[PDB]
Design a protein around this ligand. Structure first.
Ligand SMILES: [Ca+2]
Ligand SMILES: [Ca+2]
Ligand SMILES: [Ca+2]
Ligand SMILES: [Cu+2]
Ligand SMILES: [Cu+2]
Ligand SMILES: [Cu+2]
Ligand SMILES: [Cu+2]
Ligand SMILES: [Cu+2]
Ligand SMILES: [Cu+2]
Ligand SMILES: [Cu+2]
Ligand SMILES: [Cu+2]
Ligand SMILES: [Cu+2]
Ligand SMILES: [Cu+2]
Ligand SMILES: [Cu+2]
Ligand SMILES: [Cu+2]
Lengths: 286, 288, 285
């Protein structure tokens, strides 16, 4: 409901903003993908008159949605511009020194320091990254997370509209509870700016749960059913449903085709979360 | 004194367990079945625990509401009348047009006290579904009792069960706040302790299990001495799991299938102990 | 973490201790497999200076990890040597009188009394047992639970390192909430004594959630992915992932091969649980 320009976050933009990095060919034939990611302390107006003191990768919450193809060599040049030490811990296969865990290898990246995370894009699937500095709750909850999607080498069946949805919460008044919730950064954004999709088109959603404090989050779409692929790691779906649940760190792919035009609500099927920001609409054009 | 007797409580969970409402049917030009129900939202008091009177909002004067049953592809009409003091809707889990979704602000939206609306859609997809009110504030409109099961039988592929039943897991918020004071399957705390679910040894038992529990983020289901195949949302013909314990957040539901190998009493309850001890526990009684 | 000798629990030993019990051959040719289990009250130092008044099976939390082959005839000879009535309720197929439920058959086993639970090892999978005396919460939460592993009749492809991990909590104080969390008995144990595994070898973990009060637990491993088999009841995996959730009573098998040497953290992806004890390392050689 806070306008994107004022809030500092544009959830509509984030929805389809896949950062494929800058590519080059290695002397082995493989593709190299590179990103720069800077941790920066930044204020965000998440609700009318509510300023959230965030810790963010590249000045946005959620952080960049990284995209790679299975097998690619990856380099993430991380610079910490925050007042606190941070890391980037990737969900994916990598060496212990590349794990973003304090005490192992480079460990905590102090303010003003840099480090290059190197690993291969494996396994294929829908993953994520987040800070792993202790105390671990604030370092994730303050905004340090983003999507990491690895497309299978041979590719997936082609989608007409591919998007990313990161579910989070905002702890504004301290304690161990959330005051607001959102998809892609702003409470109620998609109520005022519905997700625009076309009738019958294959929609593919990478749904990632980063919600802290609360043990489980959920996702429901009105009038519609989707195939769900847990972690996006298998090519056949595990469920066909209208409601799925994810604990923190769980994620997957949903695929559907909207059979009818109009507005269809989507939201957490936990009522408390929906009424505090985690609700929106799809607007399906004929 | 035990669980509150059905006659006194105003809900009969045992009857609900096996009451699949097939509606009234007629044949369309095209060969398809037209299946119709009348559903009325009514404010009603229910004695859920001895001396504890829950002021419910109910469809057709029962909590859970009618368990609607259809066959895949049927044309459906639900003739809704709001006889309550507050605006209400019916939002179905199933495929339907936006104007038929029961969401305030979309199409007809909120149904005012005294007013009526016919929800129309096809019975699709096959599976185990549900319906509930979608009026804001969301929590009390579901938690006060406005929900029921909606079962769509596949046209092809599901072996006949010897005993088919429905179990709706809920909670009762009696004193305000964001917490439940009692829990039930099919309406009354501890009913199936006093009136165990009667099944036959070796017979195929098929349960449609639906979670509507508000406030608490997750519910579960465990059966003593037994294992079941579980079909999430009942939308697939092959089971996802073979287990004795499953979990569901609100809005999740599925089919359990089992055959009880031994006669006797077998407890079933939430494997969340708090819920079990506050009414979500019962027995199966397996006859030889 | 508290050292194992002081604590009265050794999580490293528990990790690989599969109790196959005592076996004999029935006239049928079938295996009869038997265990003795005693409920005893015992104090455990779970955190520096924090003494937990436990109710334990055979003086350990978690209790013995029972192992059997599918189809075995089983007998568990139970004696209650505690101050409160107790039972053993098994997750597995059995007759109603063998269910360890108060009011059914022998029901509650009073202090000093004994009962032999008899059933077959069926179905194959990863299971558990725990007390079923009311009030239910303290009777599980005070320590009366353990693993029950039934191997399929034709077997599983062999693991290089097979282990059991029971996730729990400790309610040490007033309210019905947990103050500490662990895998296999001791908060943070595997931080100080990492799980030693070899690079590329098949690791099979029987992961069991017995956590009371909190509705759900989770498991995540850094830099690694595992195949997950819910309840261990199927020979094909349901998921390939790095994070899995279980409510109380849920359990499953995880299978993985570590492709790189070094230390890889494992812990609940519920942050509060990890920071209060449910955190460890794998040390890959
Ligand atoms: Ca707060
Ligand atoms: Ca209350
Ligand atoms: Ca406590
Ligand atoms: Cu950080
Ligand atoms: Cu809905
Ligand atoms: Cu993580
Ligand atoms: Cu809704
Ligand atoms: Cu209503
Ligand atoms: Cu049980
Ligand atoms: Cu719903
Ligand atoms: Cu039980
Ligand atoms: Cu006990
Ligand atoms: Cu991780
Ligand atoms: Cu149990
Ligand atoms: Cu971690």
């Amino acid at each position: 409901s806070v306008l994107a320009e004022r809030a500092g976050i544009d959830p509509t933009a984030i929805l389809r903003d896949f950062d494929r990095g800058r590519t080059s060919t290695l002397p082995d034939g493989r593709t190299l993908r590179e990103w720069d990611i800077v941790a920066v302390d930044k204020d965000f107006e998440i609700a009318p008159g509510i300023i959230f003191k965030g810790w963010s990768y590249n000045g946005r919450i959620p952080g960049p949605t990284l995209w790679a193809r299975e097998g690619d060599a990856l380099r993430i040049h991380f610079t910490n511009a925050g007042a606190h030490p941070h890391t980037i811990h990737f969900h994916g296969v990598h060496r212990a020194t590349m794990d973003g865990t304090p005490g192992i290898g480079a460990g905590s990246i102090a303010p003003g320091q840099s480090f290059t995370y190197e690993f291969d894009a494996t396994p294929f699937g829908t993953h994520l990254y987040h800070c792993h500095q202790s105390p671990l709750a604030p370092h994730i909850a303050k905004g340090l997370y983003g999507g990491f999607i690895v497309e299978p080498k041979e590719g997936r069946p082609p989608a007409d509209d591919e998007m990313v949805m990161v579910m989070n919460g905002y702890n504004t008044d301290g304690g161990d509870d959330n005051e607001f919730y959102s998809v892609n950064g702003l409470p109620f954004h998609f109520m005022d700016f519905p997700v625009k999709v076309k009738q019958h088109e294959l929609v593919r959603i990478h749904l990632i749960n980063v919600l802290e404090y609360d043990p489980i989050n959920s996702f429901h779409i009105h009038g519609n059913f989707f195939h769900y692929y847990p972690t996006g790691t298998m090519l056949t779906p595990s469920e066909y449903t209208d409601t799925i649940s994810q604990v923190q760190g769980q994620r997957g792919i949903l695929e559907l085709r909207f059979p009818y035009p109009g507005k269809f609500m989507f939201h957490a099927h936990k009522t408390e979360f929906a009424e505090l920001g985690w609700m929106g609409f799809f607007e399906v054009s004929a």
